[PDB]
Ligand binder design. Structure first.
Ligand SMILES: CC1(CN2CCC3(CC2)CN(c2ncnnc2Oc2ccc(F)cc2C(=O)N2[C@@H]4CC[C@H]2COC4)C3)CC1
Length: 464
């Protein structure tokens, strides 16, 4: 049953009606995660899954009369009636409350597994786990489909609906599970990970193996407010690969600012980075500019998570790169590799591997080609060259002694090209200490007047 204070806010006819519902729920000790996620999923379904009116803008013509069709296209909002949303809410709570007095303010491992099994066993047996728009309880209720972290959110939402206030969402930079118990020290896997589960297990073994997936234990223990922030970050504006709903972007943006003003992103580095990326494209007057927010996310990760997160520096580097700040982008990537070098590359870390691959083999090559077209230039600065080498040193040190290889011949092709962007007289100016055995073993090749492509390929692809 929905409280009477929640009912009065309906119907939701605009983004700001949604913002006030979130504003009202965040003021309470337990924001209703189920209600909020259903509303977002309903809105997302009718703005992105079943797009009622296309986003096409007609060809810019002019004439004395008005245009036959709205010349800039249309934005819209699907009205969210209380009857529709309350009915879906009642469906979910009727499901969970009926499915789980056996368990007498701490939750047992047995209880957490049962709630987790209720969600798990409701899911469709065959669907594509990486589709868009299957993150919300609206998707669970109306489609019985959830993506990987959506399972974990739904398990937490189910635990809240049974009054299990010690069960919270735990988040790494690519995985989700639950924490519970007297001091939040109990852990349980509740979903699968990767393109291929450990359900029921603790995360002790993943923390001990020092994989990026478990962040060496420096992962996010959410409270109820950070769980709202997660569902907001989980909004997917994509209508197709090349088209985002303006409405859903604007909704996510205003909701992130709402959480920001209430202080609920203080320990959420990726949320601050996501907000900065939104401000970069659609700046809000009177708000901090994106660089301020990127540095807030880095400071958050230093303050609360031992500076063991990767993405805060990737957010910053990408912004510098898109704004042609070559020195600052290369430095931020050198800082990114400086964090990863203390991790072991394990079999479930493909996501951060893919981001590093894109940086090394597409983003940096483009940044350097751009700088060469301009050509003081960054390609004439030995500090930029040294930042490039430190980036590769961190990657090599990451690989070194890891159970999974990192560098392959394709990486060496782009390294040789990037080295070539710096003239030999520039490269011969650096005097650097490397950490990785791989980079130590080719320091001389990196600063030689002629770049020996075949020798660098051999060295970069040497085993371990
Ligand atoms: C490389 C770049 C960009 N890149 C940075 C990395 C994110 C994509 C863009 C930012 N995302 C996150 N934002 C906020 N909270 N969690 C995020 O991540 C997860 C963490 C644990 C987990 F189990 C699943 C996800 C996950 O993937 N997500 C997305 C969105 C929220 C969450 C659930 O829905 C899908 C991932 C420059 C820094």
């Amino acid at each position: 049953g929905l409280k009477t204070a929640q009912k009065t806010l309906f119907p939701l006819r605009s983004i700001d009606d949604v913002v006030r519902l979130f504003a009202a729920e965040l003021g309470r000790e337990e924001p209703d995660l189920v209600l909020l996620s259903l509303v977002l999923g309903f809105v997302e379904h009718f703005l992105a899954v079943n797009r009622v009116i296309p986003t096409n803008v007609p060809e810019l013509t002019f004439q004395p009369s008005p245009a036959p069709d709205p010349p800039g296209g249309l934005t819209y909002f699907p009205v969210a009636d209380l009857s529709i949303i309350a009915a879906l809410y009642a469906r979910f709570t009727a499901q969970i409350r009926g499915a789980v007095s056996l368990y007498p303010g701490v939750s047992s491992r047995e209880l957490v597994k049962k709630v987790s099994d209720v969600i798990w066993n409701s899911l469709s047996r065959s669907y594509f786990k990486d589709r868009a728009h299957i993150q919300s309880l609206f998707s669970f209720i109306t489609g019985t489909k959830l993506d990987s972290s959506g399972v974990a959110f739904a398990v937490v939402g189910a635990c809240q609906a049974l009054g299990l206030r010690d069960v919270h969402l735990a988040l790494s930079e690519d995985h989700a599970w639950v924490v519970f118990g007297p001091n939040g020290e109990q852990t349980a896997e509740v979903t699968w990970h990767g393109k291929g589960d450990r359900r029921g297990q603790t995360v002790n073994a993943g923390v001990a193996e020092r994989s990026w997936l478990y962040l060496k234990g420096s992962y996010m223990r959410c409270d109820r407010k950070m769980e709202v922030a997660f569902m907001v970050c989980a909004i997917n504006p994509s209508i197709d690969l090349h088209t985002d709903s303006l409405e859903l972007l604007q909704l996510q943006q205003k909701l992130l600012w709402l959480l920001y003003d209430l202080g609920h992103l203080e320990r959420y580095p990726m949320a601050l980075g996501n907000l900065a990326d939104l401000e970069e494209l659609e700046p809000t007057p009177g708000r901090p500019d994106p660089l301020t927010l990127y540095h807030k996310g880095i400071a958050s990760a230093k303050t609360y998570y031992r500076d063991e997160h990767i993405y805060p520096y990737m957010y910053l580097a990408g912004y510098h790169c898109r704004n042609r700040n070559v020195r600052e982008a290369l430095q931020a990537w050198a800082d990114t590799a400086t964090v990863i070098q203390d991790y072991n590359y394990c079999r479930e870390d493909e996501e951060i591997y893919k981001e590093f691959f894109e940086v090394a083999n597409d983003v940096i090559p483009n940044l350097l080609k751009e700088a060469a077209s301009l050509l003081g230039s960054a390609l004439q600065d030995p500090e930029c060259f040294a930042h490039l080498l430190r980036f590769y040193d961190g990657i090599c040190k990451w690989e070194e002694g890891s159970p999974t290889p990192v560098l392959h011949v394709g990486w060496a092709t782009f390294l040789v090209q990037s080295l070539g962007r710096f003239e030999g007289q520039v490269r011969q100016k650096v005097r650097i200490t490397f950490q990785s055995e791989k980079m130590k073993g080719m320091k001389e090749l990196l600063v030689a007047t002629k770049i020996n492509s075949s020798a660098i390929k051999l060295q970069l692809t040497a085993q371990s």
